[PDB]
Subunit: 201 residues, 4 copies
């Protein structure tokens, strides 16, 4: 298949007590799997369309592709953006740390902006720290669903799933507590790597 | 400022009779300029939000940023994707040509899919040929407005503005004639360059 | 204020085992309450914008109003659309029953279409049975979030909340089991009343 | 057919010099016709889906229905909301006038808010004055495309098409001039009628 479901880089309960293993299991094994299958199906459907020269469902197929592929991309990044507390730095350092200070003033300012973007979403969405190739800078973006409200070429560095399935079983409606807890499991080493590789464009 | 309006790589009327110089002038000097101003303003507002520690308008600012920055990105690629008839080969060759055949079956199949995506948009949008870093392939996407219906990390290779301002003065409601004429001025050399730089990340 | 949170027409656990009392409590007391506060706030902000003659945040305010007011409208209808198993006929009758057969072929056909619309949503949304004043017919619509993918003037007759908070604590990712169970508590008398009042405009 | 294209209540050039007959012709004969055909096609497709118990394209069909039906509704109202200058009052009076003063403070405040909503749209959209059945009031809404950013049950009273096809041939990019000119042709008698009939819910 074109797209495949990546395995978690840690045990399902490795992020506890901040993120329950119950959510990690459903989220990865069920939700993420769905996006991979959906993205693959969209490509097969588009291939069939070209073969038969029948593009009647093009609008449907392009949304299916964008939605599912965006879901696959967002979650693939999401898993690696996390690590058991203590297994990674609690604050970004070196080049990443300097870059965050440069584009946000400080780590705290970045955190405040990122958190505000995360909790203010009207509907399903993501809070995302991305590398902007055109502006040569780090910005925060608020994705709607998986595939909306973002410029093409944006390279994700750090993402937070704000869909209700990501926190409801544990935090219920209190999205603020979920975000507060999530900061504890951010793998700043992974974000640093993405930054090093992202800034070549 | 962070973002600047790029000059056209050719005269305003260099794409005639395919795209009128009148549209080129309004499109570049008026429309594209607005996205640059809007993107810069959004960043300035976000900076102010951080200093005052008030993120009440975060939802508005994130959409202003995404909409305007995406407009800026899309049009910047758009201008470079075109060139006077005769300045470049009318068909992709070498690495790009082989990649199109691999991911679409043939050049014609790609054109058919891209055209269908372009003319079927319900509202404003773009037809886009992008490099998918995850699947390591070339896909067609159908953007809504400037910033919707696309996965993060998508690398734009070839884009076609389907907003009404891009063709109405010349083609009126006949979107098909606009797309058909547009193929005549596609700068495959620019697309080939974007493809080469995209494969390396 | 302009908008107020309507009380549930039954006890929080009156819909069990179909919909847990825990969900009913969070859904009504927390989620619905938030839309009421948000809708009132949006109007207050719009009033302030008029007094100060500054409409810089108009885009934000119009979306805040639409999102929150739509949330308020959707949930208000939602609560009334349900009732304890046994409080109303399990199948539409009289005028409503005849109308369903006319516009859908049969009750089963309607259920199938409504269910498909409910379970296929890509993101948050609603499955909705509405009265179309223009075509003078009953149609099914699939709302995105609370305020998207619907024609102005649509009269809601029967709505099903497909946002994850509406079913996750009980049904997890299995949306189909939620929809299936939901049919058991549909208050056809309320729907019949909305239909009668809708036909007269 | 279920939906039919209404004829204009005046000659195509009756709104000049404010709105050219060229736009009126294309807009009504081409654009509006498309929405009617599209809305009818969506219903036929949904009927076929129920017959064969095949709801695979439900997401596509529901968007096609919402988009096209919303376009049909919006334009049907739009045509009647206008009249040759001098054929209708230049300002709302009686019950409508009183209602506007009540919910906006004054006619001028309403105009300012409505105009701001019209010119600030990011993408295609509508500025709309609607009757809110739940709040028992008149509000302004900013529709995105034809079917987004509005609560169910909203009854349109006055609408302004802000899609580029509505003004580009005459006003180019200067949407402000289009809105300013449009106020001259508003048929306040039609809006008054809609208000009288709208407020019964
Ligand atoms: F997910
Ligand atoms: F543009
Ligand atoms: F809700
Ligand atoms: F139109
Ligand atoms: Fe998720
Ligand atoms: Fe453009
Ligand atoms: Fe809900
Ligand atoms: Fe229009």
């Amino acid at each position: 298949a074109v797209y495949t479901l990546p395995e978690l880089p840690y045990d399902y309960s490795a992020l506890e007590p901040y993120i329950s293993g119950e959510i990690m299991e459903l989220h990865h094994d069920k939700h993420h799997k769905a996006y991979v299958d959906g993205a693959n199906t969209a490509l097969d459907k588009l291939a069939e369309a070209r073969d038969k020269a029948d593009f009647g469902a093009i609008n449907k197929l392009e949304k299916d592709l964008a939605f599912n592929l965006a879901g696959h991309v967002n979650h693939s990044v999401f898993w690696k953006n996390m690590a058991p507390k203590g297994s990674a730095p609690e604050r970004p350092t070196d080049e990443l740390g300097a870059a965050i200070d440069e584009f946000f003033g400080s780590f705290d300012n970045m955190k405040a902006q990122f958190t505000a973007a995360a909790t203010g979403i009207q509907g399903s969405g993501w809070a995302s720290l991305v590398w902007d190739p055109l502006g040569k800078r780090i910005n925060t973006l608020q994705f709607y669903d998986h595939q909306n409200n973002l410029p093409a070429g944006s390279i994700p560095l750090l993402q937070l799933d704000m869909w209700e399935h990501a926190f409801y079983l544990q935090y219920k409606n209190v999205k603020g507590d979920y975000v507060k807890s999530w900061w504890n499991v951010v793998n700043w080493d992974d974000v640093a790597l993405r930054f090093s590789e992202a800034r070549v464009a």
